[PDB]
Amino acid sequence: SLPWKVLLVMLLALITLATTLSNAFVIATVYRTRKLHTPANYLIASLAVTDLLVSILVMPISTMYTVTGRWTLGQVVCDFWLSSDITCCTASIWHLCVIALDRYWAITDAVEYSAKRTPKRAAVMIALVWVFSISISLPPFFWSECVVNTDHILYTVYSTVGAFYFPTLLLIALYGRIYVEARSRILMAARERKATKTLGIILGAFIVCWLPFFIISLVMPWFHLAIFDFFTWLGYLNSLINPIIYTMSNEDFKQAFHKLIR
Amino acid sequence: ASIAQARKLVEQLKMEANIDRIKVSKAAADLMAYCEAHAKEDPLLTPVPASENPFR
Amino acid sequence: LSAEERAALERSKAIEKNLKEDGISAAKDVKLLLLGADNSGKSTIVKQMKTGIVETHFTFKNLHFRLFDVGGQRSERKKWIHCFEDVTAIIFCVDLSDYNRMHESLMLFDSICNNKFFIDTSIILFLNKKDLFGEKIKKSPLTICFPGPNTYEDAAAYIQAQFESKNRSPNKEIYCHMTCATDTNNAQVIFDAVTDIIIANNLRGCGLY
Amino acid sequence: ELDQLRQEAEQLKNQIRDARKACADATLSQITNNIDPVGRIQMRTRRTLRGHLAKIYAMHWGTDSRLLVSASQDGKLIIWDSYTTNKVHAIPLRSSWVMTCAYAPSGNYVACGGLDNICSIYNLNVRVSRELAGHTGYLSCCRFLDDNQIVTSSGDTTCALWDIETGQQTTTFTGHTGDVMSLSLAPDTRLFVSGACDASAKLWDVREGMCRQTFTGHESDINAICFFPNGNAFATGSDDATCRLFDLRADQELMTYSHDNIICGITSVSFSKSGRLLLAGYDDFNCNVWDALKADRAGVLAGHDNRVSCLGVTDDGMAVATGSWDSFLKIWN
Numbered sequence: 064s065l066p067w068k069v070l071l072v073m074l075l076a077l078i079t080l081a082t083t084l085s086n087a088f089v090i091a092t093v094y095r096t097r098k099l100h101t102p103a104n105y106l107i108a109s110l111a112v113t114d115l116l117v118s119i120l121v122m123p124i125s126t127m128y129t130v131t132g133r134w135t136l137g138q139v140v141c142d143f144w145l146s147s148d149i150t151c152c153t154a155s156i157w158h159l160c161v162i163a164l165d166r167y168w169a170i171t172d173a174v175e176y177s178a179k180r181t182p183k184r185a186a187v188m189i190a191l192v193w194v195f196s197i198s199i200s201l202p203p204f205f206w207s208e209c210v211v212n213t214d215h216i217l218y219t220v221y222s223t224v225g226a227f228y229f230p231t232l233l234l235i236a237l238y239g240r241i242y243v244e245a246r247s248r249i250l251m252a253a254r255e256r257k258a259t260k261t262l263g264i265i266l267g268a269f270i271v272c273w274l275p276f277f278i279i280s281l282v283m284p285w286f287h288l289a290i291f292d293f294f295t296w297l298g299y300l301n302s303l304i305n306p307i308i309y310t311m312s313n314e315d316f317k318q319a320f321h322k323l324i325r
Numbered sequence: 326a327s328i329a330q331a332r333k334l335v336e337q338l339k340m341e342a343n344i345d346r347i348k349v350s351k352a353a354a355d356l357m358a359y360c361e362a363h364a365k366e367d368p369l370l371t372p373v374p375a376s377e378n379p380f381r
Numbered sequence: 382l383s384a385e386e387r388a389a390l391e392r393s394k395a396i397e398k399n400l401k402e403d404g405i406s407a408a409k410d411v412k413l414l415l416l417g418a419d420n421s422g423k424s425t426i427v428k429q430m431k432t433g434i435v436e437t438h439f440t441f442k443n444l445h446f447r448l449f450d451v452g453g454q455r456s457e458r459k460k461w462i463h464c465f466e467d468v469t470a471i472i473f474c475v476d477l478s479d480y481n482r483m484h485e486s487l488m489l490f491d492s493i494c495n496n497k498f499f500i501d502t503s504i505i506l507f508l509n510k511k512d513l514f515g516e517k518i519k520k521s522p523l524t525i526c527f528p529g530p531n532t533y534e535d536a537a538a539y540i541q542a543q544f545e546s547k548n549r550s551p552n553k554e555i556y557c558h559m560t561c562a563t564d565t566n567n568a569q570v571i572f573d574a575v576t577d578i579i580i581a582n583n584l585r586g587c588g589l590y
Numbered sequence: 591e592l593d594q595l596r597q598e599a600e601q602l603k604n605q606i607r608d609a610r611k612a613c614a615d616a617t618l619s620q621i622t623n624n625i626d627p628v629g630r631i632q633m634r635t636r637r638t639l640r641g642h643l644a645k646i647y648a649m650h651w652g653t654d655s656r657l658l659v660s661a662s663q664d665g666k667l668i669i670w671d672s673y674t675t676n677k678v679h680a681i682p683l684r685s686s687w688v689m690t691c692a693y694a695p696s697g698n699y700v701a702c703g704g705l706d707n708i709c710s711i712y713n714l715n716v717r718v719s720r721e722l723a724g725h726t727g728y729l730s731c732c733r734f735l736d737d738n739q740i741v742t743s744s745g746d747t748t749c750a751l752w753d754i755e756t757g758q759q760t761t762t763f764t765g766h767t768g769d770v771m772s773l774s775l776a777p778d779t780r781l782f783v784s785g786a787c788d789a790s791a792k793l794w795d796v797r798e799g800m801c802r803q804t805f806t807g808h809e810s811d812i813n814a815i816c817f818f819p820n821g822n823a824f825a826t827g828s829d830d831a832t833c834r835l836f837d838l839r840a841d842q843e844l845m846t847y848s849h850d851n852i853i854c855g856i857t858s859v860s861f862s863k864s865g866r867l868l869l870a871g872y873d874d875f876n877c878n879v880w881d882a883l884k885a886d887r888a889g890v891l892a893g894h895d896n897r898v899s900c901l902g903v904t905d906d907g908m909a910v911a912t913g914s915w916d917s918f919l920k921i922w923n
C-alpha cells in the first residue's frame with residue numbers, strides 16, 4: 064500500500080542521508096585536522112570516500128527502484144547504476160581487507176613495516192582496489208526493469224568470489240593472525256575482553272551485512288525478490304556502519320570529531 | 326659561606342632601597358601620553374589601509 | 382625583477398627539498414630519554430650500546446637509535462623535559478647497590494611517570510649493578526625500605542614491584558630488566574622493549590589491546 | 591650574624607614595600623577608566639609559514655621587519671621572508687634542541703641555543719662564527735645588543751653579557767634564585783630585564799653590571815618578559831595565568847591582566863608599536879590581545895592547534911607572528 068511506501072521512502076532516504084552525513088564528516092575531519100595526515104588514516108578516509116560514492120551514485124537511485132519496482136531513467140543510466148553499484152560495494156569490500164592488510168603488517172612486522180608505510184604506498188593500495196573494482200564491472204557490457212545481467216555463469220562465479228569470498232577468506236585469515244598476535248601481546252583480562260569485542264565488531268559487521276547478499280548470488284545463478292531488496296540495503300547499511308567502527312577504535316579521530324563539532 | 330649570601334643580599338637590598346621612586350598617577354600618565362601620541366602611528370591599533378599594508 | 386623573485390623561490394626549492402629529506406630521516410629514528418640518579422651507570426650503558434645534554438647515535442638490529450642523557454643541570458626539571466615530549470620510550474636507570482639512590486631515584490621516577498607530557502609515553506626500567514647488589518644484600522639486607530625474606534630473587538623483585546607500583550597509568554607498560562654491572566648485551570632488551578612499545582601503539586591505534 | 595642580617599634585610603624589604611604603597615595614590619585602572627577602549631579588533635591571518643617538522647620553540651623579527659628567524663626542535667633554524675612567504679636561509683643546528691633564537695639589529699648575525707649550554711652564532715654559505723660556551727645550564731633566552739655584543743640568560747641562575755669578536759663573558763649578572771627563563775632589552779639598550787622561575791623580574795644595567803631593582807608580582811614561575819616601547823615599563827607572562835605590567839620609575843606592579851577561564855600559563859608576550867595593545871601567547875592554543883590601559887581583552891587570536899611558544903611583534907609594528915608547537919608561524923595583520 065501507499066502508506067507503507069511512504070514509511071519505506073522515508074526510511075531509505077534517511078539511511079541514504081545518514082550514510083552521506085557519516086562519510087562527509089569523516090573525510091572532512093582527516094583533511095581539516097593536521098595530526099590525522101598519516102598513511103593509516105588515509106585508508107580509513109578512502110573507505111569513507113567509497114562509502115560516500117555508494118550514498119551518492121547508488122543510494123538515491125536505489126530508493127526509487129525498491130518503492131516502484133519498475134525502471135524510469137533510460138537504458139543508459141541503468142548501465143551506469145549497476146556497474147557503479149558493483150564497483151562501489153566491491154571497493155568498499157576491498158577497502159576493509161586492505162586496511163586489514165595494512166594492520167596485519169603493522170602488528171606482525173611492526174618495526175619493519177613502520178619504515179615502509181608512506182603516503183605513496185598508501186595511495187598505491189587505494190589505486191589497486193579501484194583498478195580491481197572497475198575491472199569486475201567491465202565484463203557485464205554484452206547488452207522493462209533494470210535487473211543485473213546474468214549470462215555467463217562463469218563471470219558470475221568469477222565476480223562474486225573475487226569481489227567478496229576472497230576478501231572474506233583474506234580478512235578472516237588476517238584478523239585470525241592479528242588476534243593471536245594481540246593476545247600474545249596482552250598476556251589485563253579486561254583488555255582481552257575489548258580485543259574480542261573489537262575483533263567481533265570489525266569482522267562481524269562485514270560478514271553479517273554482506274554474506275546474505277553474496278549467498279543469494281549462488282542461490283540465484285529459489286525465492287522471490289522481496290528478500291533481495293532487503294539484502295541490498297543491508298549491504299548499503301554496512302557503508303554507514305563501516306566509518307563509525309573504524310573511527311571508534313581510533314582515539315585521535317574520536318577526540319578530533321568531538322573537538323570539531325562541539 | 327652562609328653569611329656571604331646574606332651580606333650580598335643585604336648589600337643588594339641596601340642599593341635597591343635607596344632610589345628615587347615616584348607616584349603611580351605620574352607614571353601612568355606618561356604611559357597613557359605615549360600611547361595617545363603614537364595612536365595614529367600604530368598599524369595594529371587602528372587597522373591599516375590595503376594599499377599601504379604589504380601583506381594585503 | 383621577476384627573475385630575482387624566481388631566484389629567491391629557487392633558493393626555497395632547495396631548502397624545501399633539504400628539509401623534507403632530513404625530516405623523514407629524523408622521523409623514522411627512535412628517540413630515547415635516558416633519565417636516572419647520579420652514579421647509576423647512565424654513561425656506562427651508552428658506552429656499552431655504542432656539559433648539558435649528551436647525544437648518542439648507535440644502531441642495532443636494522444634500526445637507528447638516539448639515547449639522550451640529561452645531566453649536570455640541577456635546575457627546574459619542568460623546563461628541559463617538555464623539550465622532548467615525543468620520545469618513544471623513557472630509559473630509566475637505577476643504582477641497585479645504593480640506598481640513597483633507591484629512595485631518591487624512586488621519587489624522581491614517580492614525578493616523571495606522573496608528568497603530564499610523559500603519561501602518554503612508555504618506560505624502560507633498568508635496575509643496574511645487579512652483580513654488586515647480590516653481594517650487598519647478604520651483608521646489609523633490604524630491611525630499611527619497609528619490609529619479605531633477604532634473597533637476591535626476592536629483594537630485587539620488591540624493588541621492581543615498588544617501581545611498578547608507581548605507575549597509575551593505563552596504556553603505559555613499564556619494561557624491567559637487571560643488568561650485571563655493565564657487561565651484558567642489554568641493547569637487545571631496549572630493542573625488545575621498543576618492539577613491544579611500537580606494536581602496543583599499533584594495537585592501541587587499531588582498537589585491540 | 592645570620593639572624594641580624596636577615597632582620598636587616600627584612601626591614602629593607604618592609605621599607606621598600608612601604609615606599610611603593612606611599613607612591614601609589616591612584617591606580618592605572620582608575621585613571622584610564624575615562625579613556626575609550628580599543629573595542630572588538632582582531633587581526634586577520636595574513637600568512638601561514640609551512641616548513642617546520644617538530645615544535646617551534648622560538649622566533650624573532652629583524653630590524654627591517656622583513657625577515658623573521660624561527661628555531662625548532664627539528665634541528666633546523668629557518669630565516670623566513672614575511673612578504674614573500676618564502677625560505678631565505680635554513681641553518682642546520684649542531685644540537686637538535688633549541689629553546690631560544692635571536693636575529694641581530696644590523697641583519698648579519700643569527701644566534702641560537704638550548705640544552706647545549708652554548709649560544710651558537712651564525713654569520714649570514716653559513717657556518718659557526720663564535721660558539722659562546724660558558725654556562726652551567728641550558729640557554730633559556732638571548733638577544734643581540736649590537737653586532738659585537740650579545741646578552742644571554744640561562745638555567746644556571748645567572749645571565750651573562752658576551753663579546754662575539756673575543757668569544758668570552760664581559761660581565762656576569764648574578765641575582766636570581768631559580769632558573770632564568772626570558773629577558774628583554776630596552777630600546778636604548780642601556781638597561782634590560784629578566785623573569786625567572788622564582789617569580790621575580792630584575793632590572794639590570796648593561797655597562798655597570800648590577801641589579802638595579804627587583805619586581806615581585808607573580809606567584810608562579812615567570813616564563814616570558816617584554817619591554818614597553820618607551821623604556822620605562824614592561825609586561826611579564828607567568829605560569830599563574832596572569833600577565834602583569836610593571837613601572838621602572840614607580841618600581842611596582844601597575845596592572846594585572848587576567849581571566850578565570852584562562853587557566854594555563856603564558857608562554858610569550860609582546861607590545862605593539864604604540865604599546866596600547868599587549869599581546870600574550872597562552873598554553874591553550876590561543877593568543878589574547880589585551881589592552882594595556884583598560885585591563886580587558888580587545889580581541890583574541892586562534893589559528894594554532896597546539897600551544898603557542900613564541901610571540902614576536904615587528905619593530906615598526908606592522909604585523910605579529912605567533913610560533914607554535916603545531917610547527918607553524920601564522921603572521922597577523
Ligand SMILES: N#Cc1ccc(N2CCN(C(=O)COc3ccc4[nH]cc(CC[NH3+])c4c3)CC2)cc1
Pocket residue numbers: 148149150152153210211212213219222223226276279280283284286287288291295298
Ligand atoms: N529474483 C532474483 C534475483 C535477481 C537478480 C539476482 N542477482 C544478484 C546476483 N547476481 C550477480 O550478478 C552478482 O552481482 C554482484 C557481484 C559482485 C558485486 N560486488 C558488489 C556488488 C553490489 C551488490 N549490492 C556486486 C553484485 C545475479 C543477479 C539475484 C536474484
